[PDB]
Design a protein around this ligand. Structure first.
Ligand code: MG
Ligand code: MG
Ligand code: MG
Ligand code: MG
Ligand code: MG
Ligand code: MG
Ligand code: MG
Ligand code: MG
Ligand code: MG
Ligand code: MG
Ligand code: MG
Ligand code: MG
Ligand code: MG
Ligand code: MG
Ligand code: MG
Ligand code: MG
Ligand code: MG
Ligand code: MG
Ligand code: ZN
Ligand code: ZN
Lengths: 118, 38, 59, 97, 162, 43, 222, 51, 38
RNA sequence: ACCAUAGUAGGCCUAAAAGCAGCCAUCAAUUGAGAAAGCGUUAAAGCUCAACAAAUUCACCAACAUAAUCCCAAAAACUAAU
RNA sequence: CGAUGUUGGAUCAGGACACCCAAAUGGUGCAACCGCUAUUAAAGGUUCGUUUGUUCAACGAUUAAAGUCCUACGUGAUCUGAG
């Protein structure tokens, strides 16, 4: 029988070089995910289809942002072969209420607050 | 449909073949051949 | 049709009619290696003797 | 020494080998001597004598072989190798005889 | 290079060894620590069947390969150079290294087919009558797998079968 | 002249089709994205 | 001139009586009346039992999986018994007599109607199991020479091995797998279900790790 | 310095001018074109436009 | 001559030779030892 | 490539068993050569192996025919390709 | 299955080669004549009768030989209809 699948925790214990490699900080985990749906749910089991639906990942190549809490990481772990996950970065920090209209999201995964001054 | 075990070697699903082909052993290649070293 | 615009001659003998239309000559797609007798003695002495044969040995 | 035995040395009269033991170049001629001196080649014909001439001063090793064609084959091994001497010997002394 | 001379005078035959001058290894190699002759000149994975100036250094005046213990080649490279020499003979380079035979130059045969990079010998190859379809296809060998390690400047691996 | 028995891609005997350098590239690139993917899922 | 070397000497070898192979029976003495389903799963994958030597220093090692019926036992028994010095060598069965009933129908039957009847008995052999174990005051080389015949006439691919040969190829097997240059191994991808590949794989694969496929075993597979 | 079919890359060697002389050359050229514009010596213009 | 899948020397006088893109076993003493690899 | 002489037909059973149907010992001369690893003989004699000496590139395994109207894209080993 | 008419003959044969004859060879427990094997070769050949509906098979006489097969067990909008 083809079934769902366990994923041993050993997979998710990061090696010290990986920090250097993907650009994560050894000390502090990032706060938010930008998840994108890179593949299609067709030819995949219904449960992955559902997980993708409830992650807001319905439309392809569109970014979506999610908490980095374990509740979410569980579902993401199920569909991790269908998606691309990159940490959200805030060079200019989080947007105030004056900056909502000028916000834009650059492909390096970073959120710029002031877009196109004069 | 064929049984799991068979006599004739049993062609794989293409995706499995791609798996097999990507995961082949790669022998380490020394920078200089030890023979052509002193 | 465009097979009719192709003209093939086994050697170089071409009707002067067909010679008089030629605009330009395409560069040959393979670089032809010279034989050993084509090389200038300059080029032969310029390339290193790699090994030193024993004087006793006969060729 | 075998290829000489197969070839039926009986067409030969006299074989002498003149060489100079203390020279550095004589190993070849010596190899020839021990190839012709072997029991097979020696017993193919009893009409043939094998003489070893040993001198310190002569300084040039040499091999001289007479046979009944009225032929005289003289090979001066100096820079000549053993099996070149024995091949020359074979094709020379067999094809003629 | 030691020539062997034979003379016939009055029912006496003289055979003698005679020494000529051998050219010497060029004064200053790039990798003097290097073991094998190809390697100390940094020619490993560089020479092809096409490089004659290199190949003609190991062979005999009559076109055959020199032995290995004389030349000093690393075993692998010896085989490579042998392949190359065959391939180059067949390609029609080294025309001076054939054996000279006064009679046989006269009897023309159909003008030599120009070929290059030929792995087998011409007399030994059966024509492939059956080709075969896209999935089972008979491929025709070009060049030798001994040279599959030559440096590729394009980056794409040399294509050994078509 | 060399027929594939029955239907091409289905049965006990199938059309042999080989894996392409292209396919190895693609598969490997996916793998890389997934390894990174499960790095970011780790902490 | 060549210098000698000390010859291997066997003072410690004790030869048992009846050194030649026992005759094995075509059919077990208590014939199985109840028709068994065929686990093919008993030929499939690596072997657990009979992986190691016991008394002897030589063996035939099974590289594939297969069924051994009486014909093969006969073949091995005769071939080995007249190929050995009964004084200096002894042999041993590392495999049980054939116990597993295999059915057939008369040729010309339509499908269905019930199970067939018991035609013969076989022994299941998983890849990596020693078939026959030969000890003695022998050097490996003679034994190897005539053992490879037997090995070759077995249904699965097989080899003749000594203790030294076996540990050689095992250390080589693991050393090849810690040498590996490419980051992507069957284990690594399968366990973590990368690319959702678990869809195309069988559960057993997690254990087999792409070394075993059906009854076949490819040793080159890391 | 030996020469084999391979040891030398099969493509023309490139020499790109020093950055300073290049910056000078560029300013010079721009000056020239700019003169062409100021004088009105361009005949008729075409323009590729995103719309 | 026999066409065989495996060539093996049947005596000390057999020699082994590659001609016409094949392997051959020729024997001068016993011509019955002649073999051609298929 | 090279080379082969000694107790001795070792003791037995057999018409004969002389290194070589079989059973048992497996010692011993010579720098060196098994109471003999292959062939051979009715029993021998006779050819080779291992032994000295002579020398010394490297040498473990690996090879496998075919169908019926007409083969079946054409072709091609490098100018830079995550 | 709103029909892909079925055995053997006749006629005309298309093809494979796993060769029966003709050609060229290797091995022989090949002296010679015969043979027995194996390799290569498919342009051309491969009989007439007694009985059987017969294909096979048996028998008479011969042939250089009387090949093995495939073609909707080739071929009924060309024939036959014994079965
Ligand atoms: Mg199934
Ligand atoms: Mg079909
Ligand atoms: Mg099919
Ligand atoms: Mg087998
Ligand atoms: Mg010897
Ligand atoms: Mg055949
Ligand atoms: Mg075509
Ligand atoms: Mg119907
Ligand atoms: Mg209709
Ligand atoms: Mg016809
Ligand atoms: Mg044929
Ligand atoms: Mg004939
Ligand atoms: Mg015909
Ligand atoms: Mg039928
Ligand atoms: Mg019909
Ligand atoms: Mg009809
Ligand atoms: Mg009608
Ligand atoms: Mg019709
Ligand atoms: Zn080298
Ligand atoms: Zn032989």
């Amino acid at each position: 029988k083809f079934t769902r699948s366990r994923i041993p925790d050993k997979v998710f214990q990061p090696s010290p070089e990986d920090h250097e490699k993907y650009g994560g900080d050894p000390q502090y985990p990032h706060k938010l995910h930008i998840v994108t749906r890179i593949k299609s749910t067709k030819r995949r089991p219904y449960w992955e289809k559902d997980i993708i639906k409830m992650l807001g990942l319905e439309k392809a190549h569109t970014p979506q942002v999610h908490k980095n809490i374990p509740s979410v990481n569980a579902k993401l772990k199920v569909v991790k072969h269908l998606i691309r996950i990159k940490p959200l970065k805030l060079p200019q920090g989080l947007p105030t209420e004056e900056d909502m209209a000028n916000t834009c999201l650059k492909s390096n995964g970073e959120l710029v607050v002031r877009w196109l001054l004069n | 449909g064929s049984k799991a075990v068979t006599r004739h070697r049993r062609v794989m699903h293409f995706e499995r073949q791609k798996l097999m082909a990507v995961t082949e052993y790669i022998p380490p290649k020394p920078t200089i051949n030890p023979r052509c070293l002193p | 049709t465009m097979m009719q615009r192709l003209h093939l001659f086994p050697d170089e003998d071409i009707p002067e009619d067909i010679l008089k239309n030629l605009v330009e000559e395409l560069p040959q797609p393979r670089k032809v290696p010279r034989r050993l007798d084509e090389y200038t003695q300059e080029e032969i002495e310029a390339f290193p003797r790699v090994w030193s044969p024993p004087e006793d040995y006969r060729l | 020494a075998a290829a000489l035995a197969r070839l039926g040395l009986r067409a030969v009269k006299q074989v002498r080998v003149q060489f100079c033991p203390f020279e550095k170049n004589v190993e070849s001629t010596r190899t020839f001597l021990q190839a012709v001196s072997s029991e097979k080649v020696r017993c193919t014909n009893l009409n043939c004598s094998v003489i070893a001439d040993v001198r310190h001063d002569g300084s040039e090793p040499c091999v001289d072989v007479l046979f009944g064609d009225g032929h005289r084959l003289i090979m001066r091994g100096a820079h000549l190798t053993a099996q070149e001497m024995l091949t020359a010997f074979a094709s020379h002394i067999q094809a003629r005889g | 290079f030691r020539e062997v001379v034979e003379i016939l005078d009055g029912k006496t035959t003289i055979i003698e060894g005679r020494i000529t001058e051998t050219p010497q290894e060029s004064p200053n190699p790039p990798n003097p620590t290097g073991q094998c002759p190809i390697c100390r000149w940094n020619l490993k994975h560089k020479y092809n069947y096409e490089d004659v100036l290199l190949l003609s250094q190991f062979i005999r005046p009559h076109g055959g390969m020199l032995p290995r213990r004389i030349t000093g080649l690393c075993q692998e490279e010896h085989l490579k150079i042998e392949e190359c020499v065959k391939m180059a003979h067949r390609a029609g380079l080294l025309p001076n290294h054939r054996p000279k035979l006064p009679e046989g130059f006269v009897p023309k045969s159909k003008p030599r087919l120009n070929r290059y990079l030929t792995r087998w010998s011409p007399r030994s190859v059966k024509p492939i009558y059956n080709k075969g379809h896209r999935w089972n296809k008979v491929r025709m060998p070009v060049g030798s797998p001994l040279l599959k390690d030559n440096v590729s400047y394009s980056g794409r691996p040399l294509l050994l079968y078509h | 002249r060399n027929r594939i028995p029955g239907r091409q891609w289905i049965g006990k005997h199938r059309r042999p089709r080989p894996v392409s350098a292209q396919a190895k590239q693609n598969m490997i690139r996916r793998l890389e994205t997934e390894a990174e993917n499960q790095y970011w899922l780790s902490r | 001139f060549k210098t000698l070397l000390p010859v291997p000497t066997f003072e410690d070898v004790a030869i048992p009586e009846k050194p030649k192979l026992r005759f094995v029976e075509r059919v077990p003495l208590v014939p199985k009346v109840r028709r068994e389903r065929k686990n093919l799963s008993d030929i499939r994958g690596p072997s657990t039992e009979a992986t190691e030597f016991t008394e002897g220093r030589f063996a035939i090692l099974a590289l594939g999986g297969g069924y051994l019926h009486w014909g093969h036992f006969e073949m091995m028994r005769l071939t080995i018994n007249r190929s050995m010095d009964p004084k200096n060598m002894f042999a041993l069965w590392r495999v049980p007599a054939p116990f597993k009933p295999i059915t057939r129908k008369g040729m010309g039957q339509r499908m269905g109607g019930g199970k067939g009847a018991i035609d013969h008995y076989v022994t299941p052999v998983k890849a990596g199991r020693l078939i026959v174990e030969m000890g003695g005051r022998c050097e490996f080389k003679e034994v190897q020479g005539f053992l490879d015949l037997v090995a070759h006439k077995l249904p699965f691919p097989a080899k003749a091995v000594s203790r030294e040969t076996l540990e050689k190829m095992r250390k080589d097997q693991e050393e090849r797998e810690r040498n590996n240059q490419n980051p992507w191994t069957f284990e690594r991808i399968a366990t973590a279900n990368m690319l959702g590949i678990r869809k195309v794989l069988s559960p057993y694969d997690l254990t087999h790790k792409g070394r075993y496929w059906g009854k076949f075993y490819t040793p080159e597979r890391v | 310095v030996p020469k084999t079919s391979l040891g030398s890359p099969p493509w023309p060697d490139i020499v790109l001018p020093d950055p300073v002389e290049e910056t000078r050359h560029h300013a010079e050229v721009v000056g020239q074109v700019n003169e062409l514009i100021a004088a009105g010596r361009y005949g008729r213009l075409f323009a590729v436009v995103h719309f | 001559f026999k066409t065989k899948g495996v060539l093996k020397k049947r005596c000390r006088d057999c020699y082994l030779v590659k001609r016409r893109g094949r392997w051959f076993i020729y024997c001068k003493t016993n011509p019955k030892h002649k073999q051609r690899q298929m």
